[PDB]
Design a protein around this ligand. Structure first.
Ligand SMILES: NC(=O)c1ccc[n+]([C@@H]2O[C@H](COP(=O)([O-])OP(=O)(O)OC[C@H]3O[C@@H](n4cnc5c(N)ncnc54)[C@H](O)[C@@H]3O)[C@@H](O)[C@H]2O)c1
Ligand SMILES: NC(=O)c1ccc[n+]([C@@H]2O[C@H](COP(=O)([O-])OP(=O)(O)OC[C@H]3O[C@@H](n4cnc5c(N)ncnc54)[C@H](O)[C@@H]3O)[C@@H](O)[C@H]2O)c1
Ligand SMILES: Cc1cc2c(cc1C)N(C[C@H](O)[C@H](O)[C@H](O)COP(=O)(O)O)c1[nH]c(=O)[nH]c(=O)c1N2
Ligand SMILES: Cc1cc2c(cc1C)N(C[C@H](O)[C@H](O)[C@H](O)COP(=O)(O)O)c1[nH]c(=O)[nH]c(=O)c1N2
Ligand code: SF4
Ligand code: SF4
Ligand code: FES
Ligand code: FES
Ligand SMILES: [Cl-]
Ligand SMILES: [Cl-]
Ligand SMILES: [Cl-]
Ligand SMILES: [Cl-]
Ligand SMILES: [Cl-]
Ligand SMILES: [Cl-]
Ligand code: NA
Ligand code: NA
Ligand code: NA
Ligand code: NA
Ligand code: NA
Ligand code: NA
Ligand code: NA
Ligand code: NA
Ligand code: NA
Lengths: 416, 156, 416, 156
């Protein structure tokens, strides 16, 4: 018996990541096994680590955490360094509009656990972590129970299936900080400290948990790994375009008829996501903007872009927040500003003061209480959050808002 | 002096024994203490620090850092209301208004009887079901006042 | 996009069954949820099955299919028999004058679906059926869609809301036979056969679908169930008189100003239905008779009867077909005879030949071509349809016509 | 020598997979066959039986039993006219007359072009909107000749 969870709508054309998670309920190990689950693992343990890395490499799998970094390449880097090595599943998912990872955690936990075990074997890690945000209490309890189920069936512990490979997966809970999703702050938090990002380089694969080689991957990323081993990398690469192959999840929210998570190939356009899959807009109103979480803002002139990791592509986590023609862009930008205000960790001075002043001045503008200096000040700070920043929050906290400024000048100009 | 009741002390020990190193258990321990008391008692940090074999300072820094932990206000039920962009756009204000009609309180406030506290929070990762709220660990979509009133009646 | 449906007027003094179905359009799951929909289900799943049966029992709820059988008591019979068990919603509605069930199906499908889930749970049925007449295609598509909406919101499928209770609802369509609304013929039809009633006993609750305990309930009956759970049985019983409590639907047609479906308490009199609610008669002409579907004929001297299931009461489905002073009763009797002629299934000899002969001889009488023998023959067959009959069609096929002979002798004598 | 078109075979197969047992899909399949061809072709019955895993005899008796199915007259549109008590009281005859004036046919008959067939049926469960008719799945109240003519012009 688990805490109540809203039943997020989920739809797939590929029937992989969402083969079970398209149904809004916990799938336990018997159901997973009946569907051929844990067979990829068995096949993995009959292969060398190096070979597993090679398949994942050739699959073109990229990170589903937002940066789209090649997964196989990440692993190769870790294994160049002396052990012991650690594996970490990043389930902090706290970006606005992003709710793709939780339906895997909550509905198909064994797909993730299987992925963690294969991934851990591939990089020689005998100890793995799931770090799950504290606002996912049900996911936590569900994962804990699924791990036990896996233990009882001999998929975890010492000498898994006679292979000689040992693994325990520990589940850690966050406690309210967006920043703990940043991989170095994640690790700090796992070490029992505050969530303060560290300067990269070193990257985790060189120095991470207790200073040792560490691979951090996103929940979605890891959930692809059982499929790659199962189908082979060639069959995997047929899904979608050859360069950006395989399933990708798209959490779609806001002014669409069918908000939810869509499993789609990456040659899908943004227009297709909204109109073909998500059922079009509420009230059949015109699209005004799409917010890619709190990262980017696309105008209605940018809907014919692919949902891939190309230069002209949507990229990111695939998060699609739709705003229509009546929605005030300044009001929406204020909400993005308020978010970064609440989540700067404060180690870097321009980020600390910039995120705060961006929100505080934008609120003045919004309420019509802004002096001329407040306006000029707002412009300035928006452009000056980034300098000296040691992590990506500082580098992007002004990005989306700047984009609204450039793409909707007429609506901003009206706030004078 | 302050000392944890045995049934809580036991659970803190289970968390501390779960990870390879004691200090990794800090956040689970604090979630546990908050679950038990309805808040983090200031006087609980000292003995928790000894169990973690950490300085008191380190523990205090952590509690202050992580938004979920509250050291000011006891409450039996925490109504976490999302105030980020998607929930705001789809009707956070209607949820808050409905909350004020039923409970008589606004974000940040506790009811007189110490039963409900409303906590505004950032995106909860259920944006498709906006506007979203939690009642302790239970998470729901807000549909209407009549629907909300029925849900809240489930927490005695 | 559904097939065209006439916009049947609907009006309620109670605001329960017709709370939404008073507006002539489909109400999808979002509107249903806004009105507190599916919260009764959630409360139901935190009660035991036995508790739910007690509540339905204590509500005084009776069947709205026409026989007024106590619903609680029907359920109690089923659950004393070993499982597995089946739940059936009877949406065959094909009695002349009767169009009460369709407005629920077509306008508020989730009220019905919610009812089906709670009732299935109460009797331990993991598989339920809606059997809807073939001449209601819109209701069919509307139900299919609504069931999908419920699945997506997690109200159907396996382990509904973490309760451990599994349910699928299948929707079957009829194909032209009034007899398939008879509960045992319905079951025969569901099994993929001709609609031939079975000898009772056994009743379905002992032996029904695939020979297993089966509860058949009428649409309107099932639609009451969410209210009973939501209000509790005590509050529900405050509606109307305490012996025949709760809402009832009355489809009114013929020579009234405001024909349509009325949601009313059962202490309402027949005269109130026609004059207080249905706007009185077309042209303020005197009431001649009321046909209770094809079952009973009430004269102008019987309008002050309660619309309840007392011995002196209207009873039936609540169908009120009004004829006024200029309407020829023999002509109307002919139409009723023709109905039974077309719908006898012919398994039983007196029903087979009797239904045909009643209509054939009455036609001759109407057209002024009846011999003395035809007259005496018609009287005799009218009184001799029922012997050996194994279902209610043969039992009543002479009933209304007999009543017109007794209550309107002057008009019949005109034809002789 | 008789095979269903693939786009029809698929639909039939969907119905057969829908219920727990194949034979429960029989009337849905038949509806689909009639929808597709404008009637039930006798030669369709043999292979439908195979797919249902039923004797042909079973299937034939089913078709004959259920009045909606028609093995004789192909028609693109079926004008179902209620001839029961309430519609007869409120003007079935006026509707039949209007249909004869517009289309040139009476109950039982088919227009020379194979477009329209009038089918007399018992009560259609819409008695308050008497007199009632359907055009395939669409259902209407008859108001007048001119109103009926407009409606019929929508079926091409
Ligand atoms: N899913 C969510 O809830 C969520 C929340 C906030 C932010 N994000 C995303 O986070 C992204 C920023 O993440 P980031 O700063 O970690 O990105 P990054 O580009 O700095 O690194 C991405 C990944 O690649 C690895 N990497 C990169 N270069 C490497 C190298 N040379 N050697 C070894 N490893 C290397 C990093 O260690 C990391 O694991 C944004 O694009 C945003 O979309 C997602
Ligand atoms: N709504 C319509 O379109 C429509 C059409 C035709 C007929 N009808 C109605 O059908 C009615 C007759 O139906 P019927 O023959 O099912 O009535 P019935 O009295 O024989 O049965 C009523 C219900 O109670 C159950 N029941 C009765 N005695 C039982 C017992 N001893 N143990 C267990 N269960 C028992 C039956 O199974 C059935 O479900 C008529 O009054 C007529 O109004 C309605
Ligand atoms: C502020 C901030 C916040 C987050 C991140 C970044 C930054 C800058 N990242 C990305 C994270 O650091 C890292 O790139 C990924 O976890 C690596 O996994 P993949 O390569 O995507 O599999 C991130 N990733 C993830 O998996 N979940 C999350 O919740 C977040 N949150
Ligand atoms: C010829 C004939 C035709 C019908 C029926 C009976 C007979 C004799 N019955 C009544 C049916 O057998 C049964 O009593 C009810 O369906 C049981 O449900 P309730 O107890 O009324 O909810 C019936 N009931 C119903 O709900 N819809 C219908 O269309 C019909 N049709
Ligand atoms: S950029 Fe901002 S969030 Fe990142 S480490 Fe510096 S102060 Fe913290
Ligand atoms: S009484 Fe008439 S309708 Fe009923 S089973 Fe016998 S023949 Fe058929
Ligand atoms: S914006 Fe409220 S849950 Fe995401
Ligand atoms: S009598 Fe014609 S629809 Fe009922
Ligand atoms: Cl193998
Ligand atoms: Cl100390
Ligand atoms: Cl209202
Ligand atoms: Cl055969
Ligand atoms: Cl006539
Ligand atoms: Cl006829
Ligand atoms: Na979920
Ligand atoms: Na967190
Ligand atoms: Na790295
Ligand atoms: Na970065
Ligand atoms: Na009407
Ligand atoms: Na209707
Ligand atoms: Na029927
Ligand atoms: Na039969
Ligand atoms: Na029964």
């Amino acid at each position: 018996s688990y805490p109540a969870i809203p039943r997020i709508y989920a739809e797939t054309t590929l029937n992989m990541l969402l083969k079970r998670a398209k149904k809004p309920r916990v799938h336990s190990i018997d159901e997973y096994l009946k569907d051929g689950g844990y067979q990829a693992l068995e096949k993995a343990l009959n292969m060398s680590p190096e070979e597993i890395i090679d398949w994942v490499d050739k699959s073109t799998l990229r990170g589903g955490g937002g940066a789209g970094f090649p997964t196989g390449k990440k692993w190769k880097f870790a294994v160049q360094n002396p052990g012991p090595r650690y594996f970490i599943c990043n389930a902090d998912e706290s970006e606005p509009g992003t709710f793709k990872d939780r339906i895997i955690i909550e509905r198909d936990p064994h797909l993730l656990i299987e992925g963690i075990i294969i991934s851990s074997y591939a990089i020689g890690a005998n100890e793995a972590y799931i770090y799950i945000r504290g606002e996912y209490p049900a996911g936590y309890y569900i994962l804990r129970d699924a791990i036990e189920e896996a233990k009882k069936k001999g998929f975890l512990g010492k000498n898994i299936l006679g292979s000689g490979f040992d693994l325990e997966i520990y589940v850690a809970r966050g406690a309210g900080a967006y920043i703990c999703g940043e991989e170095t702050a994640l690790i700090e938090s796992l070490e029992g400290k505050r969530g303060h990002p560290r300067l990269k380089p070193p990257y985790p694969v060189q120095k991470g948990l207790w200073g040792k080689p560490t691979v951090v991957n996103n929940v979605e990323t890891i959930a692809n790994v059982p499929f790659i081993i199962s189908m082979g990398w060639e069959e995997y690469r047929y899904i979608g375009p050859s360069d950006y192959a395989g399933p990708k999840l798209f959490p779609v929210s806001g002014k669409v008829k069918k908000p939810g998570v869509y499993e789609l190939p990456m040659n899908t356009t943004l227009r297709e996501v909204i109109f073909k899959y998500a059922g079009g807009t509420l009230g059949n109103k015109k699209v005004k903007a799409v917010f890619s979480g709190a990262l980017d803002c696309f105008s209605s002139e940018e809907l014919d872009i692919p949902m891939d990791y190309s230069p002209l592509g949507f990229g990111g986590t695939g998060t699609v927040i739709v705003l229509t023609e009546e929605d005030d862009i300044v009001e929406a930008a204020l909400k993005i500003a308020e978010f970064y205000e609440h989540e700067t960790c404060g180690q870097c001075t321009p980020c600390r003061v910039g995120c705060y002043e961006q929100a505080n001045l934008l609120e003045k503008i919004y309420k019509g209480e802004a002096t001329e200096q407040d306006w000029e000040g707002f412009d300035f700070v928006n452009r000056n959050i980034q300098p000296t920043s040691i992590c990506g929050l500082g580098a992007v906290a002004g990005r989306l808002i700047r984009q609204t400024l450039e793409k909707f000048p007429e609506e901003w100009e009206k706030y004078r | 002096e302050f000392e944890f009741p045995e049934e809580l002390k036991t659970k803190l020990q289970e968390h501390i024994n779960y990870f390879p190193k004691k200090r990794q258990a800090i956040l689970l321990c604090l979630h546990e203490i908050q679950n038990y008391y309805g808040y983090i008692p200031p006087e609980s940090l000292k003995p928790l620090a000894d169990m973690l074999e950490l300085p008191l300072n380190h523990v205090e820094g952590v509690v202050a850092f992580y938004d979920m932990f509250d050291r000011e206000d006891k409450a039996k039920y925490r109504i976490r209301v999302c105030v980020s962009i998607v929930c705001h756009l789809m009707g956070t204000n209607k949820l808050l208004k409905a909350l004020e009609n039923i409970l008589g309180i606004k974000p940040g406030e506790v009811t007189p009887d110490g039963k409900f506290k409303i906590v505004p929070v950032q995106c909860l990762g259920a944006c498709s079901e906006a506007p979203v709220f939690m009642v302790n660990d239970d998470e729901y979509k807000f549909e209407s006042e009549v629907q909300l009133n029925e849900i809240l009646s489930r927490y005695t």
